[PDB]
Amino acid sequence: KITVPTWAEINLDNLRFNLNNIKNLLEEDIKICGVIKADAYGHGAVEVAKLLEKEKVDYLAVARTAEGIELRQNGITLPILNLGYTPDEAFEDSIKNKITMTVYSLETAQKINEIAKSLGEKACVHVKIDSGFQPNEESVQEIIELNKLEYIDLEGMFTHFATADEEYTYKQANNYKFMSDKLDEAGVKIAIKHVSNSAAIMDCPDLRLNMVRAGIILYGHYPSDDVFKDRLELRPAMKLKSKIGHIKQVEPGVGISYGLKYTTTGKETIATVPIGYADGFTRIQKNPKVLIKGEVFDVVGRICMDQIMVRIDKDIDIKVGDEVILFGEGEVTAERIAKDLGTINYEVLCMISRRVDRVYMENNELVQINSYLL
Amino acid sequence: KITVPTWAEINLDNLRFNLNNIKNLLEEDIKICGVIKADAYGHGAVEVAKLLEKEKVDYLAVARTAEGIELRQNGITLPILNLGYTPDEAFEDSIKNKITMTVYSLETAQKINEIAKSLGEKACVHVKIDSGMTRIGFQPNEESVQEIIELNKLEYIDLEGMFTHFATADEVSKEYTYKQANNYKFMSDKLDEAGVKIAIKHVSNSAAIMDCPDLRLNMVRAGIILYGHYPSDDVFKDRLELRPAMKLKSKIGHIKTIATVPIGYADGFTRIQKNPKVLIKGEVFDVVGRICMDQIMVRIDKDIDIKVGDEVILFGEGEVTAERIAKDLGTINYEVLCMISRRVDRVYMENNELVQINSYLL
């Protein structure tokens, strides 16, 4: 029923579990924006969006106009915020698809306004403060003007923390206050003020404002080791899986894979797994591992584009087509791969390729298989 | 008419340039297999495949059944070979879609034969020999010869082909490569003796194609070279002149001197990079700070007057190359190419005009 040899299994109940724990943290009056940029950090933005919709979150965030359109094309009705850059030639598509756009300057708000005027639609925007608009009086007047524009709905105001996962944050926090304050003095309403990312949500309870932006934590992962984990319980939602393609006993003294960078010592059982660097299992890894029936085993030799080799050095019952876990259970994790790489968990999650089908589970049953090729 | 902030421009003319130069290497009767696995090494398998049909190659090679099916769904009619593993669950789809399957055990062949019999269709297979890569395939011994002899008897199987793959054909020393070919020859000779016919015999990859003209046999497998890239720095690059086909591009989004560019690690411009660079207006600039998920910051330290929307080239022009990122990362050009994410639209060019845009999202 899964006909692909390598897939990403996404447990939807884990997303629910994570979100419910997030919600416990917050007062009822604080809105949640689920951050689903970069294909929901590799989990599949459309399917994740559908779930978030069921679960009644308030906003969804994306990084690209297309990511938003993709959502509209799939029946998503929630408000959507493009956190990232909107190029000028995409203003109209945004307005037509009801994508809230982030704006950094008065000038650009004016461009947007003119476009919405011709569509006869008010364009919803959030203003970004860089703590974007510098936090100063000159900007304060700029916004006051922006708000005058006939075809702009200035719904939101936000900033983003550099270091909430490690206070500089609270410096950044000050600047935004300087903003929120001056704008109040002037009666500019701003329905949604938001500043909190995942780390802030966790460590910084004073920073709830009108909404929080929940990203890495929705997926079941921590933004760093530093945050108060004790605070929030998480379950990772993705498992990268494969099957055993082949097995053989290799004689001693035999090179394996390209460049022959691993040489057998002793007669070794070697398994071949149909996952590679083109799947997002990067060649860069110095110490790659897999989980097979509760055991970790080393990946040996260079990682190929579509295949890897594994030394089975334990007694276990295995055959061709047995399941292999690459990350998300036991001791194989995205954090571990990330640490070996010298990068972060977010990146490992994002790397997972186009050809890797997302298989959605719910109530421990497979409910949906998404192919990006077919 | 491009609406995305970051895109991959694929120059079809360059694919043609590469292919023709590859053809010039070869005598008339040697078959060409175009290797388009991993979405044609990030270039877009469907479009590349269409180009290959138009230019008339003999075979297409994929790594997964689904890769084969995608091509069929877009009207590709050339023979397609799945180089690697086909799991049991995909046998029927393979047969129905005329995806030729790599086989390396009699047992799987028997299973394939059964599914095929039930469909009432013959399955096409190529036999893989493990000659020293130690990856997949039959060990090169007599027991395996017998096994193949038996396989050949299966009524619902067409044993079309037999191949191996070199571990080291791109290195300066060819000794292992020749050793691997010797291992293949033993099998080929023994089977010939036993009367197993075998139409398409193949061993050569891009490096073998370049460096080993004595290894043509029936067919050669061209991959990285198709895309205008060398397999290593050690091949005889003077034999084959190549043009890279892909340019990864963005445009300047914001300026303050630091330009912010809306490309990030999520696009496959990896964070791991310690010396990331970009090309703007003919000059190279440093990417500063950490690479973000969706953007990077660039330092403009020269006086050409960049403005918002000027083009930024990540690789494929001038001094910014896939190889240069690869050097930095301790990987290879193949991986950098494969890295480009689903959200990065593939924009196809020909005669310096845009002829097609593919969105993987919309």
Could you write out the three-class secondary structure of B2-20? CCCCEEEEEEHHHHHHHHH
A176 is catalytic: no
For residues B224 and B334, the answer to whether their CB atoms sit within 8 Å is: yes
- Closest by CA to A256, choosing from B179, B135, B130, B172, is B135
Longest dimension (CA), chain A: 80
What is the phi/psi pair of residue B278, to 5°?
-135, 160
Cα angle value A209/A210/A212 (rounded, 5°)? 80
B135/A256 CB distance under 8 A? yes
Half-sphere exposure of B114 (CA within 13 A, CB side): 7
- All domains of chain A in start order, with CATH: 1-11+237-374 (2.40.37.10), 12-218 (3.20.20.10)
For residues A327 and A239, the answer to whether their CB atoms sit within 8 Å is: yes
Cα separation, A309 vs A257, in Å, equals: 8
Tell whether A282 is within 8 A of chain B (Cβ): yes
Cα angle value A56/A127/A349 (rounded, 5°)? 55
For residues B18 and B243, the answer to whether their CB atoms sit within 8 Å is: yes
- Report the DSSP pairing between strands B59-62 and B80-82: parallel
Find the helix or strand (DSSP H, E) in which B314 lies.
Answer: strand B311-315
Q: What distance in Å separates residue A186's CA from the closest CA in chain B?
A: 28
> Residue B256 is which amino acid?
K
> Residue A236 is which amino acid?
P
For residues B23 and B360, the answer to whether their CB atoms sit within 8 Å is: no
Chain A residues near residue B270 by CB distance under 8 angstroms:
343, 347
Question: Which residue in the block uniquely carries the two structure tokens 């997949």?
Answer: B136
Cα separation, B242 vs B228, in Å, equals: 5
Token pair recorded at residue B146: 């017998």
Instruction: Count the residues in chain A.
Output: 374
Q: How far apart are the first and last CA of chain B?
A: 15
Cα separation, B277 vs B285, in Å, equals: 6
Specify the resolution in Å: 2.1
A3/B87 CB distance under 8 A? yes
Experimental method: X-ray
- Closest by CA to B204, choosing from B231, B243, B227, B228, is B231
Question: Using a CB cutoff of 8 Å and minimum separation of 24, what contacts does A103-107 make?
Answer: A103/A127, A103/A128, A103/A146, A104/A128, A104/A132, A104/A133, A104/B254, A105/A133, A105/A142, A106/A142, A106/A143, A106/A145, A106/A146
| Nearest CB to A306 within list B63, B90, B332 | B63
Q: Which of B1, B23, B31, B37 is catalytic?
A: B37
- Beta carbons within 10 angstroms of residue B206's beta carbon: 25
The DSSP call for residue B138 is B
A354/B330 CB distance under 8 A? no
- Closest by CA to B271, choosing from B295, B299, B301, is B295
Cα separation, A115 vs A110, in Å, equals: 9
Cα separation, B248 vs B269, in Å, equals: 10
> Counting runs of H as helices and runs of E as strands, what totals does chain B give?
11, 18
**Per DSSP, which regions of A228-301 are E strands?**
238-243, 246-250, 255-256, 262-263, 268-273, 289-292, 295-298
Alpha helices in A164-260, H assignment, sequence order: 168-185, 198-203
Integer angstrom CA distances of residue B338 from A49, A91, A270, A337, B264: 27, 31, 26, 19, 15
Secondary structure of A67-133 as H, E, C letters:
HHHHHHHCCCCCCEEECCCCCHHHHHHHHHCCEEEEECCHHHHHHHHHHHHHHCCCEEEEEEECCCE
Cα separation, B246 vs A48, in Å, equals: 32
Integer angstrom CA distances of residue B320 from B147, B230, B247, B263, B297: 50, 16, 10, 16, 17
Residues 6+ apart with CB under 8 A from B122: B116, B156, B157, B158
Cα separation, B87 vs A243, in Å, equals: 8
Residues 6+ apart with CB under 8 A from A181: none
- Pick the residue from chain B with its C-alpha nearest to A245: B85
What is the phi/psi pair of residue B102, to 5°?
-75, 130
Tell whether B38 is within 8 A of chain A (Cβ): yes
Question: Which residue in the block uniquely carries the two structure tokens 């085993």?
Answer: A297
B251/A305 CB distance under 8 A? no
Q: Cα–chain-centroid distance for residue B177?
A: 21
B134/A257 CB distance under 8 A? yes
- Pick the residue from chain A with its C-alpha nearest to B72: A374
| Nearest CB to A255 within list B134, B295, B332 | B134
Cα separation, A290 vs A275, in Å, equals: 11
Integer angstrom CA distances of residue A264 from A239, A253, B139, B169, B273: 30, 5, 16, 21, 32
Cα separation, B31 vs A157, in Å, equals: 62
Alpha helices in A299-366, H assignment, sequence order: 334-341, 345-350
Please classify residue A364 by burial: count the beta carbons closer than 10 Å to its beta carbon, then call 0-12 exposed, 13-18 middle and 19+ buried: exposed
For residues A266 and A251, the answer to whether their CB atoms sit within 8 Å is: no
Q: Which of A96, A111, A168, A258 is catalytic?
A: A258
Question: Which residue in the block uniquely carries the two structure tokens 């469907």?
Answer: B46
Q: Which of A37, A128, A193, A239 is catalytic?
A: A37
Chain breaks in chain B (C to N over 2.5 A) after: 256
Integer angstrom CA distances of residue B287 from B269, B279, B350: 11, 10, 31
Residues of A157-178 as b/e, b for ≥16 C-beta within 10 angstroms? bbbbbeebbeeebeebbebbeb
A258 is catalytic: yes
For residues B160 and B125, the answer to whether their CB atoms sit within 8 Å is: yes
- Give bridge partners of residue B129 from the DSSP assignment: B138
- Beta carbons within 10 angstroms of residue B348's beta carbon: 22
Cα angle value B318/B324/B330 (rounded, 5°)? 175
